């Protein structure tokens, strides 16, 4: 019931794994230490192995016994006969660092109990000592423990440990001298300038009123990517089903109208363009659609990670009308619901290192404003999706509100926020007959 | 001979298959969850393995054991001496899927028997209850476990898995070469261009101020759809009772004044029409009406599903003045109430694969606007109506407000939103003496 | 404890009722069926009497035996000696319809447990069978149960039923004396329609805010019922004593104000109308009043049954501000205390076969809402008494709230629930200067 908590079987398993593989010792040398172990024979074995890996790389069965022999230690450290059992056991695979980490943790635990014993000792043993000379000692010891637990990554880093990563990214980008696109491209040249391409660890938002084009624009982004991104994409159509999506997308990629598709009065050239774009999409095999209705961020994360390990690793994610996302815990408070959603999506993007398009709606506030250009406040709910987002870009198409516009066939992509870049107003030509946005070779902005 | 149904060979085999194959947990995690398993040690083991494949993938023999020792459950779930025997056993190849499948099947059956025994328990124990709660209890439990189970067409589909269905639909339409109508005809060819008929998965919205005749239009639609489609139709008269509904529908059908019905001031010349319409209606057994007051979403769902599986599968729905539809929990928050409403209607359509008309009101925002041609934002409440919709077509009779125009007797159907089609300015003619809209072969609209 | 539940006493009583009454076969046949019984001889007698009441009118004692001899089945169902006891027993009064309905309920329950065991067997016995065809079996079975149901009024209606009333209008509607009532006449003809009077074996709930007039209504009811019936009625006034109740009632009847009564400013023209109604209220001796404070449901039962035996059988029970009812067992937990009291009053309603008027309050959840027209949830405790009652109806007099109103003097009785009919919303008139609701002569609602 009561004992020093220690695991000693996985310990020997690590020992034999190091024996049968003289390559991966540095990675466990990061974690495991000679005094980390519990019993002294294992400690002798590991520290001898370490002294040898300084000098003698080959250490499996006999170099160990020889180095142990030259200084006269056989049968005082167990035995070569006993060592046979260690090399015999654990022919296991690269599942070694797990054992290493967990036993390293057990060592930390054992040390904690040791120091609690020391504190109890110094407590019941006064030695003519005061609370002020005692609690301060206790604080200093526990401080030395928690401060130094062989942990480097999670803690606040000195600047030289940050500039290494910064210069590393700069070398990753200079070592490939290429265009002014530091991530995913869209297919649109007027927008890649104000974005440097959809960057790879952000939460993009694509918001606009309902009849405006945001699902259309998003599908255009993803299909263009998947035509120039040899790497998967995802599409979560929580609103409409896959069979509307793909129809819209064939119309987009082939510049034929949607009625002609669904109803079936299309001409030989139309049939040909369809044939070609199909036979393209079926080769690259990027697009993966999920027409699930009421998802949660957990389901999103799982269904994205499933791809991201087996189909390689992914290039972007699209999410239609995230206000349908749910989390039943926060089912009463809608505001905190959306905040949890958005935080989880940003976390996902930082996890998988991809962008996360996340379509959203706007509120019926701009209608009584007479300009109609959507400002960042005009987001459907919670105000936090303008806070966790590293990019927002609204859509406004003046022909909807003004029949007397000189701005018809024209949609402008109001960048309404961008942390790592400028704001602006891109413009593009709308042709919803085949559900596409296209570039605008015309006046500047 | 008889036992609560379960095998163990499949179960333990899958468990060891996961012990020695740590990559294939997705395929297994999709299907089986801890509560599926029969015995407790296996459940503890499974939840720990999920916990580990979340963070730490490599788990074979003793990583799980130390995860288990973090709970201190040594030997409560068998023991390392036992779990090692499972590590030895079941070297199983790709037959993990089928073993997990039969484990799952036995568990679902087990749940069904549990429900049967529990209903028998509440039967022998009347518990101070009347059967009007008990039949509903049986229905609710059975379908709850059904739809809690039924969501097994899920996951991120591949692209070809989409295009199969898409092209199947396109062929199904081309396999019936007919007019430009894919859905439910409206009877108004001026309208059946822009819409291709009331599509089979949509939420249509017919809306205008009360003195425009929205109810007349929807009754005309369901009238025509019952006459054309040899298929059931439902109606929910939340506002008024059937005594007016039928007496107005017959006026729509047979071109006779409503007054001349209720007052008897008719003649045999018109009565020929009446007797014809009636006799046509009875031998079809088509038009179904519910003259309730405040029905909720799930009441509507159950009723529609009842009429569905009995009489083939329904073909249209009308829902007048949805605002009366309540849900008691969301009585404080009106906005979330209407949101829930609209979402349930849309998912009902998706369930039955039919259309869902739903009339709705407009606010006093546009009276003080000087144009009065309604817009999508004027929809009286909550804004998610126009976001969860597929087709919004208003009314604007100019005659009611302006008088000096030749557009009188002429009601126009402003399509103000359509995802899978265009916007428009349809014009139809009005004869309110018998409550109908008719076509208009007039100048270009 | 654990048994197939089946009514046998009331069963034989219904059978002997059919014996001693050839008339009452139609409506009883609309509910009970030969398969509705438990044992065989009862089924034999029922099918014989059904075949005979089709053709052979006289069946009380002898013609049953004559037909039983025509088919030659003597001593198969007992015998004529076994039969004589059936005509011997059950001299009961007209209370047979409730017996028939509860036996129908018991048959439905018996079917339910039979199906439950069938499903248990089907689950234990796959016989090489996918669970698809097993859950489908169960669900199809449940729907085949609940589909037929011998019930066609809670739900939509085929057009055959609609056109029944629609054409019945145009010929047969000379029925304007629709006094179709079964139970206690409420004294309100506009209200007696939608409720069908107080069905004598249910639980009524009258509830509203305090300044609203509910006690005045639930005194008006017993006030009329004392006069119309020649039957006693009970008044458990847990709020205020008899001396104010009666001083109110005299004023309700005589049409003078409480003030002049408790003051003495009243002349001959009031003296006469007091003397008359006083004389009427003495010449019947129906009403009994209990000015208690802290009654328990046990005391409710005891004090209804002290009088139910002496005076024939009581006609109406009236509890005032229910929530004061205590039970010192559940003196800590309020929720289960209220649920206990509700179940107890419903049990008493079943026991004496009388209607229970039992008031309640409304929490302050409507007053954070501009509607202020209450609903089923605004019910002040436990959400329990919206289940143990076949009737609820709430009140709303707007002119307590709005001083500007043109709805003053007026008070709608919202009916929030019925399990034996449709809900509605009456529109009375309130004149509290003499503490009365009157039937309203005005426009629609
Ligand atoms: Mg969309
Ligand atoms: Mg009172």
Swiss-Prot record, chains A, B, C:
Q: What induces it?
A: Slightly induced by hydroxyurea.
Q: Which residues are in the SF4 helicase domain?
A: 177-444
Q: What does this protein do?
A: The main replicative DNA helicase, it participates in initiation and elongation during chromosome replication. Travels ahead of the DNA replisome, separating dsDNA into templates for DNA synthesis. A processive ATP-dependent 5'-3' DNA helicase that acts on preformed replication forks (have single-stranded (ss)DNA tails). ATP is the best nucleotide for helicase activity; GTP, CTP, dCTP and dATP are poor substitutes. Participates with DNA primase DnaG in primer RNA (pRNA) synthesis during initiation of DNA replication. Has DNA-dependent ATPase activity.
User: What is written about domains in the entry's comments?
Assistant: Loader protein DnaC alters the inter-domain and inter-subunit interactions of DnaB, inducing an open ring conformation that allows ssDNA to access the interior of the DnaB(6)DnaC(6) ring.
Q: Give the binding site residues for ATP.
A: 211, 214-215, 419
List this protein's GO terms for biological process. DNA replication; DNA replication initiation; DNA replication, synthesis of primer; replication fork processing; response to ionizing radiation
NCBIfam families named in the record: DnaB, PRK05748.1, PRK08006.1, PRK08840.1
Query: What EC number(s) are associated with this protein in UniProt?
Result: 5.6.2.3
Activity regulation information from UniProt: 5'-3' DNA helicase activity is stimulated 2-fold by single-stranded binding protein (SSB) and 6-fold by SSB and DnaG primase.
Which taxonomic lineage does the organism of this UniProt entry have?
Bacteria, Pseudomonadati, Pseudomonadota, Gammaproteobacteria, Enterobacterales
Query: Which species does the entry assign this protein to?
Result: Escherichia coli (strain K12)
- Its protein name is Replicative DNA helicase DnaB
Q: Which of UniProt's keywords are assigned here? A: ATP-binding, DNA replication, DNA-binding, Helicase, Hydrolase, Isomerase, Nucleotide-binding, Primosome, Stress response
Which family does the entry's similarity section mention?
Answer: Belongs to the helicase family. DnaB subfamily.
Signal sequence span is none
A GO molecular function held by the record: 5'-3' DNA helicase activity
Question: Which superkingdom is the protein from?
Answer: Bacteria
Cofactor(s) named in the record: Mg(2+)
Keyword presence, ATP-binding: yes
Q: Which residues are connected by disulfide bridges in this protein? A: none
